[PDB]
Design a protein around this ligand. Structure first.
Ligand SMILES: [Fe+3]
Ligand SMILES: [Fe+3]
Length: 674
């Protein structure tokens, strides 16, 4: 079927027609076609797409912000990359290029003439105006007026020149396309080169695209954030910011995303930089950056889990919003808001609400159906914090979140001051059934806390993967229960959840978690991958529930790494590995706040509460480990370990890394995109 590509002005349209013609000549008559829709600005394109008049357009990431808002509701679907195919970069540097010997530094921009790629764009507008606008004198609104009065003349393509004449002074009419000579990276650079402006806000590659001679480039330099200047090839140490790459956008909820990828992937295969055919994707005799940037080297599909907000990233989204609404944030660490806890489905949501009531406004609740969904919400600001198994502390880390406190399990000296080395991942088997002794584990039945968890998955599958050297655990074992697995997998066959709950990584799946995995072993499995205290915790009437009330510790043993099968209590000499304690994670901007609030909360409702029936206890939940593990003694300080690498530690990081291939996690791929 055909993708209607939105071209802005006649030069993009000419390249678009050649694109179309060359694709017809090269792909089967059944594959992807491209058609061309002409519009007068990227914004006309966004609206055309939202209205089903076109399907695709490439946007600078700042402009992706505009496209994602209602009523447009567009989303990134295919991203440009730069650098090379051998080293794909999905980001670039915003720089400020000036002429050598103009004198002024970044903090001396007032009264200079500025050249911008376009209003609302990353390098050309959001980054540099973001750096200046909070020092601008009242009235700050509208932003354009303040910017107009700051510089003594600008070219800001797509600005309203009738309202703000000074913003088009260097480019009358602020034309929002390449028919305006000063439009875009190369137009803004030309604005500086001609001597119209004194500064051009563009990307790190712009000058190299426009001046091939080093001797010519020597007449320019960059403005660094520390109010010094450096040569134009030193952009790595002299840039204003790093920003996400330009990306093709399409309608959310039905925008032909696979057709667009199929078209572009086949396109980069025939007309990419490595194929000097009659048609090139990434250049044109009719101008630069037409349809895609000349600096792009190819396309990468955006991960399905990665929505527009995650594509831009928390920091940049927040900066944009504040820029548009003209607001200058008065520090998150000064206000310190209530903590929005993310509860895993309704079981946790109910406990969290009780907590919310008892915290009298310190704690608020949000819910999601999986740990990944919750982490994504913390990333984007819908929630603030949650406690995570080390396997997801790892993923959260890759997603840019940091650990703030650790659950501790060892009573009780000064628990908050005493960091623990970690609990133990063990392999539990039923005594006298029979020669189940590692090695011949193939074809057996396995129980896991959930896909992606330390003791339940990463540790054993890690060790398992070393042997078999393929990623198909679902056919190493004959079947099992591993919540979070593909619903058709044999590793879902043993799960107990009803209807659509089957194999869900939450408590609606009865086998999810430490206790659930033990129940799986007792009822269905041959081996349960759990923590070392699970068997003691769920035997001898410790678990009052009917399935466990009459179980006892003597009937279970541990699988040793050497084939031995010591009893449960000898975990210290018979474990698969050490597991770093679960930890609370949050965003950097809220870490101090969450830290303080959580310490006072556990002082109110921690493991020093009595009753637990009348009173609310933060670290009890029957047997379900709601919000925190039930054997949590307190939340403890991390000290130097406020980073996922530093916290989890070298051994476990490499052990998880060793399982990078095999990973099924859609959030991991999303967070690992740049
Ligand atoms: Fe850009
Ligand atoms: Fe765990």
């Amino acid at each position: 079927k055909t993708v209607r590509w939105c071209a802005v002005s006649e030069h993009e349209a000419t390249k678009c027609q050649s694109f179309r013609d060359h694709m017809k000549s090269v792909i089967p008559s059944d594959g992807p076609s491209v058609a061309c829709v002409k519009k007068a600005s990227y914004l006309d394109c966004i609206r055309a797409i939202a209205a089903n008049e076109a399907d695709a357009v490439t946007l600078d990431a700042g402009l992706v912000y505009d496209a994602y808002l209602a009523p447009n509701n567009l989303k990134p679907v295919v991203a440009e990359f730069y650098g090379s195919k051998e080293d794909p970069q999905t980001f670039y540097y915003a720089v400020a290029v000036v002429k050598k010997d103009s004198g002024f530094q970044m903090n001396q921009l007032r009264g200079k003439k500025s050249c911008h790629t376009g209003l609302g764009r990353s390098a050309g507008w959001n980054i540099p105006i973001g750096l200046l606008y909070c020092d601008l004198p009242e009235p700050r609104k509208p932003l354009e007026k303040a910017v107009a009065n700051f510089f003594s003349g600008s070219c800001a393509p797509c600005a309203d020149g009738t309202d703000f004449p000074q913003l088009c002074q260097l480019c009358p009419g602020c034309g929002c396309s390449t028919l305006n000579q000063y439009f875009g990276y190369s137009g803004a650079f030309k604005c500086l080169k001609d001597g119209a402006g004194d500064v051009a806000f563009v990307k790190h590659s712009t000058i190299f695209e426009n001046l091939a001679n080093k001797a010519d480039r020597d007449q320019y330099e960059l403005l660094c954030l520390d109010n010094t200047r450096k040569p134009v090839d030193e952009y790595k140490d002299c840039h204003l910011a790093q920003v996400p790459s330009h990306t093709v956008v399409a309608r959310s909820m039905g925008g032909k995303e696979d057709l667009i990828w199929e078209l572009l992937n086949q396109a980069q295969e025939h007309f990419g930089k490595d194929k000097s055919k009659e048609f090139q994707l990434f250049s044109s005799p009719h101008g630069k950056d037409l349809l895609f940037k000349d600096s792009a080297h190819g396309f990468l599909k955006v991960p399905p889990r990665m929505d527009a907000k995650m594509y831009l990233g928390y920091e940049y989204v927040t900066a944009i919003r504040n820029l548009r609404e003209g607001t200058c944030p008065e520090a998150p660490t000064d206000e310190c808001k209530p903590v929005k806890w993310c509860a895993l489905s309704h079981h946790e949501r109910l406990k969290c609400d009780e907590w919310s009531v008892n915290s009298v406004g310190k704690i608020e609740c949000v819910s999601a159906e999986t740990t990944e969904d919750c982490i994504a919400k913390i990333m984007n600001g819908e929630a603030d914090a949650m406690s995570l198994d080390g396997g997801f502390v790892y993923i959260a880390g890759k997603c840019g979140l940091v650990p703030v406190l650790a659950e501790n399990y060892n009573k009780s000296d000064n628990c908050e001051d005493t960091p623990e080395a970690g609990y133990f991942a063990v392999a539990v088997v039923k005594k006298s059934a029979s020669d189940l002794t590692w090695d011949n584990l193939k074809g057996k039945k396995s129980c896991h806390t959930a896909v992606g968890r330390t003791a339940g998955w990463n540790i054993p599958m890690g060790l398992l993967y070393n042997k078999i050297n393929h990623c198909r655990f679902d056919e190493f074992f004959s079947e099992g229960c591993a919540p979070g697995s593909k619903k058709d997998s044999s590793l879902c066959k043993l799960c107990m959840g009803s209807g659509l709950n089957l194999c869900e990584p939450n408590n609606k799946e009865g086998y999810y978690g430490y206790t659930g995995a033990f129940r799986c072993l007792v009822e269905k499995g041959d081996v349960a991958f759990v923590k070392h205290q699970t068997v003691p915790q769920n035997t001898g009437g410790k678990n009052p529930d009917p399935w466990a009330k009459n179980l006892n510790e003597k009937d279970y043993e541990l699988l040793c790494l050497d084939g031995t099968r010591k009893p449960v209590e000898e975990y210290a000499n018979c474990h698969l590995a050490r597991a770093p304690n679960h930890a609370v994670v949050t965003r950097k901007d809220k870490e101090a706040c969450v830290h303080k609030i959580l310490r006072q909360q556990q002082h109110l409702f921690g493991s020093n509460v009595t009753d637990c029936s009348g009173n609310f206890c933060l670290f009890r939940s029957e047997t379900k480990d709601l919000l925190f593990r039930d054997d949590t003694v307190c939340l403890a300080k991390l000290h130097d370990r406020n980073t996922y690498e530093k916290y989890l530690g070298e051994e476990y990081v490499k052990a998880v890394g060793n399982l990078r291939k095999c990973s099924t996690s859609s959030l991991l791929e999303a967070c690992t995109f740049r």
